[PDB]
Amino acid sequence: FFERAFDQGADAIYEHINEGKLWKHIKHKYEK
Amino acid sequence: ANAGDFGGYYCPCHGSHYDASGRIRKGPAPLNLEVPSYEFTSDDMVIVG
Amino acid sequence: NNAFIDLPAPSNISSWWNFGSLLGICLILQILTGLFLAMHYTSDTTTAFSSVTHICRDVNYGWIIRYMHANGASMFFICLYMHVGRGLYYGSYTFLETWNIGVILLLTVMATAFMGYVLPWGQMSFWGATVITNLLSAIPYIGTNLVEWIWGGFSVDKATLTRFFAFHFILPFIIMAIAMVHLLFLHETGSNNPTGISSDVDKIPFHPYYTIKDILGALLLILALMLLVLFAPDLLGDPDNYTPANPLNTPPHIKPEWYFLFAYAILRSIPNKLGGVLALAFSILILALIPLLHTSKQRSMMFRPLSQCLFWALVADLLTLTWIGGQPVEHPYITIGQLASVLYFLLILVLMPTAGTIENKLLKW
Amino acid sequence: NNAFIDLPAPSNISSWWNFGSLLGICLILQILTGLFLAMHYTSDTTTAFSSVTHICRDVNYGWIIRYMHANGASMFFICLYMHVGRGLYYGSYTFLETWNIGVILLLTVMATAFMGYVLPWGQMSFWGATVITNLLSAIPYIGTNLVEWIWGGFSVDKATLTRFFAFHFILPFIIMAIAMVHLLFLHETGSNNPTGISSDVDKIPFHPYYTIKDILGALLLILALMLLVLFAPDLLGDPDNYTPANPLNTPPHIKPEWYFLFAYAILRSIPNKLGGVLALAFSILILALIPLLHTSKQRSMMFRPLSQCLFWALVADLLTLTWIGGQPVEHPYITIGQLASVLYFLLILVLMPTAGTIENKLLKW
Amino acid sequence: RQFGHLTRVRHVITYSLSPFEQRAFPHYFSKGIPNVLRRTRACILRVAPPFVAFYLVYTWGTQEFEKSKRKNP
Amino acid sequence: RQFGHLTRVRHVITYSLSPFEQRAFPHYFSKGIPNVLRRTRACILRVAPPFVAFYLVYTWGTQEFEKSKRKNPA
Amino acid sequence: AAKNVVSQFVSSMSASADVLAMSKIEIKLSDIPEGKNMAFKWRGKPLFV
Amino acid sequence: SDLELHPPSYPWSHRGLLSSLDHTSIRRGFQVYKQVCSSCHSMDYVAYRHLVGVCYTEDEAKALAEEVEVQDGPNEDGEMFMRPGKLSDYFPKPYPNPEAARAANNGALPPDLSYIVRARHGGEDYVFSLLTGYCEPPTGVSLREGLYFNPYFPGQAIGMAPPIYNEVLEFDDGTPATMSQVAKDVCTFLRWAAEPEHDHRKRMGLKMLLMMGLLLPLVYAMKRHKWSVLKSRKLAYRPPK
Amino acid sequence: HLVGVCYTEDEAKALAEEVEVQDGPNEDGEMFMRPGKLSDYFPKPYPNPEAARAANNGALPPDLSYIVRARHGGEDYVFSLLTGYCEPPTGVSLRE
Ligand code: HEC
Ligand code: HEM
Ligand code: HEM
Ligand code: HEM
Ligand code: HEM
Ligand SMILES: C/C=C(C)/C=C/C=C/[C@H](OC)[C@@H](C)[C@@H](OC)[C@@H](C)CCc1oc2c(O)c(OC)cc(OC)c2c(=O)c1C
Ligand SMILES: C/C=C(C)/C=C/C=C/[C@H](OC)[C@@H](C)[C@@H](OC)[C@@H](C)CCc1oc2c(O)c(OC)cc(OC)c2c(=O)c1C
Ligand SMILES: CCCCCCO[C@@H]1O[C@H](CO)[C@@H](O)[C@H](O)[C@H]1O
Ligand SMILES: CCCCCCO[C@@H]1O[C@H](CO)[C@@H](O)[C@H](O)[C@H]1O
Ligand SMILES: CCCCCCO[C@@H]1O[C@H](CO)[C@@H](O)[C@H](O)[C@H]1O
Ligand SMILES: CCCCCCO[C@@H]1O[C@H](CO)[C@@H](O)[C@H](O)[C@H]1O
Ligand code: FES
């Protein structure tokens, strides 16, 4: 439990710090 | 095109003969020439891809 | 140093032992002319070919540097084949480490010359790059992925040429390093000689005996290179590479550089994709097997009449394959090429080892 | 092994002895990222800059390889200056052969980094290539001819960029070979240590003691490199090189890469062309004189307080010169720069040798 | 250079413990800090002055440059 | 490998002349040619045959190729 | 760390974003006479119609 | 003059070490470039495909590309022709060459904006200050025709007239288009244009820090472990007497 | 390239001035025509291969800079080709 957990946890922290700013966060407003 | 023993095609690199359907008939090639996706249009043309 | 001066050397080695130094000279010549060509060459597909014509037409003496590099590549192979031939005939391959490094050197020079031929981006350049890289597509399941990875796309294009310039630039220097290891291993044993018998009881100093012979050899090599460069620069080349690459059209009589013809004939002789590529690879890699196929109680072929006949039959056969590689895939060449291909492997894998055993019995041991 | 494992090493060397390995790592890092950049870079003046933006925008991870190469160059110099400083302070320069090869290495890396900076063909690229090559025009009677020969014309142009790519490509490998010789000479004596006293009575195996310290160092170097690459990739760079080269306009606040600023300040301090170029050359070559200027009866500065003060004055002075090199040629910077330049040479040629003699008398020998 | 051929040594005894029998950070702070302070006080008089000079020349020079470009220094 | 440590040799005497006391091309032709003939005649039976075979296969194959392309009246 | 770094460099040799920018191709069938094989450049590869 | 006015530091949402760009702001910034700056400034290194997954969907970007006409060809007759733009096309250049650009701007050359934020000290702080910093010349300053006074431009005389003002454009999301808002958004878009790797390097940076936070103390412990043998050794000198 | 090979410098300068070549852009950003000069390369009859084919019934006249090196037979081939046109043999029918 390293690369998976490490990568997901870090991505989670990153996305949390940048909540609402990333494309994946606003994408729904423009998108089958 | 039009070379080889089947009126189709002849590959000069190592002697592969294909027919007018692009099917391999003689030589070292293992498969028939590939067929891509395509659709014909309302302007007589064809759109490949 | 202990690479020259007081290095003990056999008193009886012949001119066939001159090719090692000639190879070092070919490598230095290729590196020098190459570096000077790289000072003017541009690897963009839109400018590659033009930059080469610029070298030959407007760069001072650019033409002589360019043709010395092209023909130098040819002299490199003539020397390589003579060097390997000497090794086989005299049983020099029993120096396993030196020999195996030698096999790696042969493969690396082939790869280097291939990539170099791609740089001017002429028709032979583009189709050679297409065909040779696709040899990897014969690898089950990942072959296609490997090819596109090497190309840097779905076809030979800009990304391919730029990386080939980079690979061609550096590989020769790697070859130089490997060559030095080739020599370090050889110095541990010293050289073999025509009789195949140990020469420890009759060694002479490398200098002045072989330093002068090496110089004479170097002069002859230079004579041969310049006769080509100054009187027949395109003799060993292909007219089709004087035409810019056209990705929509493969020349109807396309054929490989002369030094690749025998291998081309072998691959063409097999009407199966994977089978031809495997035969191609084995045609070279079989060299690494030679030491294991040695059955004779004697090292050299000097005292082995039957082995000699078979050896020359193998040379005549490679000449046969070279000729066939240059002919169209038509009768009767298809059959001759297949027989020649079979004989190549039959000679090395069966006939020579067998003759060695026969010769042993004739001498009662 | 005879480059690691059982190599005897002083039991007391400090972290200042870690820079040799960090330099080896920087060189490998530069060669690897460099080779990958060369797989996409084209040296035609019309496409150079574009090919670099292509690397950073469309090549997978091209941006990290590019910025690791750029910042790697900076880490290389930080390590070079720390390495040289360690040598000066501890009297390591008494290993004359190792030290002099060291000087050659410093000069070769500077030349390599200069040419590399020219490749993206930005404004700093073009004017740096212009100014640095013109240093040769200071040579009497043939200077101008040498410059035009190097340029391949009457000005920096296409021919220049193409040959600089070729020189930048190969020089790093020559540096690698020279570095190996640097180490072969060092192994003959073994390492110096902080006390400057022979450590033959207290040696420990290189492995595991320094192999583990070297790894720790490597990790810290990588941390520093990636902090720059991932959090501040342009911090140590110049915004002006993000503008394509314009041969008709030199930016008004043009300045050298940070690691060249001290030398730039020295050259700018002299209102004479030949004088400035000579001072520039001497600012580096004076390193080769240091061994001859050693007056102390003791090797290291560890036990020499006066020498220490002057040493740190020399470091503070180089910092002063670095600062000045980054300021406009205006009062009061002009005078400070001239005083700093004079002090640099005064410290090395007069003050330090004199302090050594004073220290000797104080110890009654 | 090889162990066994370095130099001549007589009458010296060395005692050592396996790394597994000891602490890797013995008195890291209770001693580490005090020694760091000792080493710092021990060199600061040789190291710091030149940089204090740099600092002064820098601030004076920078401010001097500023004042020089104004209307009323 | 170094002179002095190669192998053991006993009871062998070697006599030599300075190169300045002798001819560099002694009997170059009166002996050179005869020896070359000896060496040639000594190997030709081992070397030549395979190439004579190549020659035959080449001429036969080439001529066969030519003949095969000439109109076969149908 | 090493696996990540190595795959990033290896990845850099794969097709760059501009190469994957592709797109279809429209062909005019009338311009091709009966019996003619026409080659078109579609993705650096020949496309026969 | 030779006097200098350096831009202040604005608290951009992407200023922080682990702070990403605000993609809605990038989207609005693109609109500013498209509607306003593109008439004079090129952005040679950015293509419609680059916008996909950053500030527009693939369908939206394709639609944006189809808004323009780009030259292509030659065709079967050897003629060049016009076609709707597509994802692979780079943003249209307002001029065929810099000479024409200068001719259309009183001799001044509007620089390519692809890297403007990286090509200028101050980055977006400079661009924002410049865009929102136009004011009347100070008493005693007289500018030649075609030049405008801007305290943030070196020399203070710039050949670009104030390019933005209230309502210079209408945003797709209704955001009030005040001058400062427009500048803030175009500067954010320009940051992305110059450094598209921006968000990814910071994410990788976080992982690098977490990995070093782990590995450094561990390797340091390995170092101390091995060295403990030497650090605690004791010596004794017992010469015969 | 003709200078010192088959024409004097003055003659070559005159040969170059016989053609009008595009240059620029000028200060208005416009491309313009000018007399050719020694540094100019021989004018291309077509702007691109598509146009060349369009003007030659689909056939593409190749660039002749290297034709002699790009063909087996060299000048023997080119000479034979140039002086070898004849009427088709019996049974052979050539398209327009
Ligand atoms: C034509 C009417 C323009 C419009 C619309 C915009 N700009 Fe411009 N810009 C223009 C010119 C002629 C110049 C050159 C100025 C000079 O005197 O050199 C510029 C310059 C800039 C700069 C560069 C400033 C510098 O530091 O050199 C920037 C950063 C700039 N312009 C930005 C910019 C933006 C974002 C615009 C849309 C909001 C914009 N410009 C519009 C001409 C024109
Ligand atoms: C870049 C290519 C190469 C270089 C520079 C090189 C160089 C040398 C040199 C200098 C020698 C000593 C002189 C001589 O006997 O010729 C040598 C010996 C030898 N080489 Fe190579 N070589 C190369 C490639 C190869 C290859 C392709 C093989 C075989 C697959 C090989 C096998 C050997 C062997 C077995 C010897 C010992 C010869 C003997 O003493 O009988 N070499 N080589
Ligand atoms: C083992 C050494 C080498 C071999 C066998 C080799 C072989 C070749 C070959 C076969 C060609 C094509 C020649 C042609 O027909 O145009 C080529 C081209 C080229 N090589 Fe090398 N090469 C070697 C070393 C080098 C080195 C060291 C460099 C650069 C530092 C270099 C630079 C070039 C360049 C720029 C070209 C393109 C120009 C041209 O086509 O002549 N080569 N090389
Ligand atoms: C590509 C650059 C260089 C590399 C890879 C390199 C590498 C090394 C290595 C591995 C060591 C042993 C470890 C150490 O003590 O740091 C060393 C020692 C040394 N190097 Fe370098 N070096 C380089 C450049 C230089 C320069 C620029 C100088 C001086 C002008 C120099 C002078 C020395 C000296 C005198 C030593 C002995 C240090 C001592 O034992 O006290 N080196 N170098
Ligand atoms: C001693 C090692 C080296 C040093 C100090 C060095 C330094 C540099 C520098 C300062 C730049 C400019 C970076 C920038 O701001 O864009 C550069 C560019 C470049 N270097 Fe190196 N380099 C080294 C080795 C290499 C090697 C071995 C190669 C190729 C085999 C290489 C290939 C390149 C390429 C292609 C560029 C242009 C792309 C770019 O600007 O990033 N470098 N190098
Ligand atoms: C990135 C680097 C890569 C992928 C390098 C791989 C190199 C592989 C091998 O070298 C080790 C390879 C060169 C070597 O195989 C043993 C040769 C004898 C291959 C011989 C060879 O040449 C041809 C050639 O030259 C052509 O030119 C116009 C055309 C060709 O057919 C149309 C061929 C061909 O059909 C063969 C078999
Ligand atoms: C074909 C190869 C050639 C000709 C190589 C020669 C290399 C020479 C030296 O290396 C050995 C040299 C790099 C080294 O001198 C010791 C540096 C410290 C020179 C420092 C240096 O940099 C500048 C620079 O970078 C610039 O960039 C934008 C601009 C510069 O002024 C406008 C300078 C400058 O005025 C000086 C002195
Ligand atoms: C030493 C004499 C070697 C024989 C020269 C023949 O050389 C061959 O000529 C062919 C065309 O004739 C070329 O297509 C081929 O590439 C070339 O190697
Ligand atoms: C690791 C600490 C290095 C010192 C940080 C400042 O670094 C400096 O920043 C300036 C403005 O950004 C640059 O113009 C200059 O080239 C750079 O060296
Ligand atoms: C490190 C010592 C700082 C250098 C002080 C420079 O001082 C400056 O020198 C100029 C020389 O022309 C004078 O004209 C000027 O008035 C004076 O302030
Ligand atoms: C920031 C405002 C400073 C005033 C400078 C404007 O100056 C004006 O610019 C016009 C541009 O169309 C010129 O046609 C006009 O002749 C010139 O006087
Ligand atoms: S590539 Fe077509 S027959 Fe080999």
| H15 and H65, same domain (yes or no) | yes
Q: Structural domain tally of chain C? A: 1
- Mark yes or no for CB contact D56/H197 under 8 Å: yes
- CA of I72: which chain C residue's CA is closest? C239
**C242 and I70 in contact by Cβ < 8 A?**
yes
Four-CA torsion D322, D327, D332, D335, nearest 10 degrees: 50
Question: CATH number of the domain that H75 lies in?
Answer: 1.10.760.10
Residue whose CB lies within 8 A of the most ligand 6 atoms, among C81, C103, C114, for a mutation test:
C114
On whether the CB atoms of residues D264 and D256 are closer than 8 A, the answer is yes
As given in the structure block, the two tokens for residue D101 are: 């090869």
Element (H, E) at D6: none
For residue C98, give the CATH number of its domain: 1.20.810.10
User: Which of D 55-114 lie inside 8 A of G, CB atoms?
Assistant: 57-62, 64-65
Element (H, E) at D69: helix D62-90
Distance C360 CA to ligand 7 centre (A): 71
- Do G12 and D32 lie within an 8 Å CB cutoff? no
C-beta atoms of I50 and H103 within 8 A: no
CB of D335 closer than 6 angstroms to any ligand 10 atom: yes
Binding site members of B for [2Fe-2S] cluster: 11, 14, 16
Q: Half-sphere exposure of I12 toward its Cβ, with a 13 Å CA cutoff? A: 15
Ligand 12 pocket test, candidate residues B9, B16, B17, B24, most atoms within 8 A of CB: B16
Q: How far is G22 from C145, CA to CA, in rounded Å?
A: 18
Token pair for residue C294?
A: 């040695």
Put simply, the answer to whether C154 touches G39 (Cβ < 8 Å) is no
Burial class (CB in 10 A: 0-12, 13-18, 19+), I21: middle
D323: nearest CB among E46, E51, E58: E58
Q: Which residues of E touch H239 (CB under 8 A)?
A: 10-11
Q: How far is CA C53 from the centre of its chain?
A: 27
Token pair for residue B6? Answer: 């089947």
Nearest-5° Cα angle at F34, F33 to F35:
90
Contact residues for D292 (Cβ-Cβ < 8 A; gap 6+): none
Q: Which residues touch G14 (CB under 8 Å, ≥6 apart)?
A: C148, C149, C152, D60
What the block records as the tokens of H110 is 């509007």
Structural domain for C274, as ranges: 1-365
Domain housing F57: 1-74
Contacts of D169 in chain C (CB under 8 A): 38, 166, 169-170
Token reading at C245:
């690459």
Q: What is the 3-state secondary structure (H, E, C) of D26-51?
A: HHHHHHHHHHHHHCCCCCCCCCHHHH
| End-to-end Cα distance, chain E | 67
Token readout for D320 is: 């002063």
Element (H, E) at G13: none
Q: Are residues H204 and H106 in the same domain?
A: no
One domain for residues H101 and H212: no
**Which chain G residue lies closest to C130 (C-alpha atoms)?**
G45
Asked if D230 and G4 count as a contact pair (C-beta separation under 8 A), the reply is no
Phi (first) and psi of residue D150, to 5 degrees: -65, -45
C-alpha to C-alpha distance for D237 and D243, rounded to whole angstroms = 13
Q: Give the separation between CA C74 and CA C227, rounded to whole angstroms.
A: 13
Radius of gyration of the CA atoms of chain D, in A: 22
Q: Are residues H108 and H220 in the same domain?
A: no
CB count within 10 Å of CB F63 equals 11
Atom of ligand 9 nearest to the CA of D255: 16
CA distance H105 to C78: 65
In single-letter form, the type of residue at position D204 comes to I
The phi-psi region of residue H233 (left if phi > 0; otherwise alpha if psi is between -120 and 50; otherwise beta) is beta
How far, in Å, CA of C178 to CA of C180, rounded? Answer: 5
Structural domain harbouring H230: 197-240
Q: What is the DSSP letter of D351?
A: I
* Per-position b or e across H91-101, b if 16+ CB within 10 A of its CB: beebbeebbbb
| Residue the block writes with tokens 């933006």 | D53
Which residues on F lie below 8 Å from C319 (Cβ)?
A: 51, 54
The Cα G30–Cα D268 span in angstroms is: 73
Local structure of D235: helix, strand or coil: coil
H50 annotated among ligand-binding-site residues: no
CA angle E66, E70, E72 (to 5 degrees): 120
- The Cα of H41 is separated from the nearest Cα of chain I by a number of Å equal to 16
| Residue numbers in I near H101 (CB within 8 A) | 29
SS3 H81: strand
Interchain contact, D316 vs E6, CB within 8 Å: no
Name the active-site residue from B13, B14, B31, B39: B14
Tokens linked to D22 = 């960090």
- Which residue has 């895939």 as its token pair? C329
How many Å apart are CA H76 and CA G32, to the nearest integer? 12
Computed from CA positions of residues D5, D9, D14, D19, in that sequence, does the dihedral angle turn out positive or negative?
Answer: negative
Between chains, do F51 and C330 touch, taking CB under 8 Å as contact?
Answer: no
Closest CA to D175 of D21, D23, D4: D23
Cα D235 to ligand 9 centre (Å): 5
Asked whether I73 and I67 are in contact (CB, 8 A), the reply is: no
User: By what method was this entry solved?
Assistant: X-ray
Q: Does A touch C (3+ CB pairs < 8 Å)?
A: no
CA distances from E19 to H218, H225, H227 (A): 16, 6, 8
| CA–CA separation, D155 and D134 (whole Å) | 10
**Total of domains in chain E:** 1
Q: 3-class DSSP state for residue G45?
A: strand
**Does ligand 9 come within 6 angstroms of the Cβ of D111?**
no
Closest residue by Cα to residue D20 from D279, D236, D221, D164: D221
CA distance D317 to D314: 5
Chain-centroid distance of CA B2 in Å reads 11
Is the shortest distance between the CB of H183 and ligand 1 below 6 Å?
A: no
D207 among the known binding-site residues? Answer: no
Which amino acid type is present at position D40?
Answer: H
Instruction: Calculate ∠ Cα B17-B21-B25, nearest 5°.
Output: 30
For residue I21, give both structure tokens.
Answer: 């070549």
Distance set, CA D280 to CA D133, D261, G3, G49, I19 (Å)? 13, 11, 45, 68, 52
Which residues of chain C does G45 touch, with a Cβ-Cβ cutoff of 8 Å? 154-155, 247
**CA diameter of chain F:** 86
Q: B10-27 in b/e burial notation, b at 16+ Cβ within 10 A? A: bbbbbbbbbbeeeebbbb
Q: Is C46 within 8 Å of chain I by CB?
A: no
At B44, which helix (H) or strand (E)? none
At D179, the amino acid letter reads A
In one-letter notation, the amino acid at residue H167 is E
Q: How far apart are CA H66 and CA G28, in angstroms?
A: 22
DSSP assignment of H137-183: PPTT--PPTT-EE-TTSTTSEESS-----TTSS--TT-----HHHHH
CB-ligand 9 contact for D323 (6 Å cutoff):
no
How far is the C-alpha of E17 from the C-alpha of D178, rounded, in Å? 42
CATH number of the domain encompassing residue E1 = 1.20.5.210
Interface contacts (C, G; CB < 8 Å): 38
Burial per residue of F27-62, b for 16 or more beta-carbon CB atoms within 10 angstroms, e otherwise: eeeeeeeeeeeeeeeeeeebbeebeeebeebeeebe
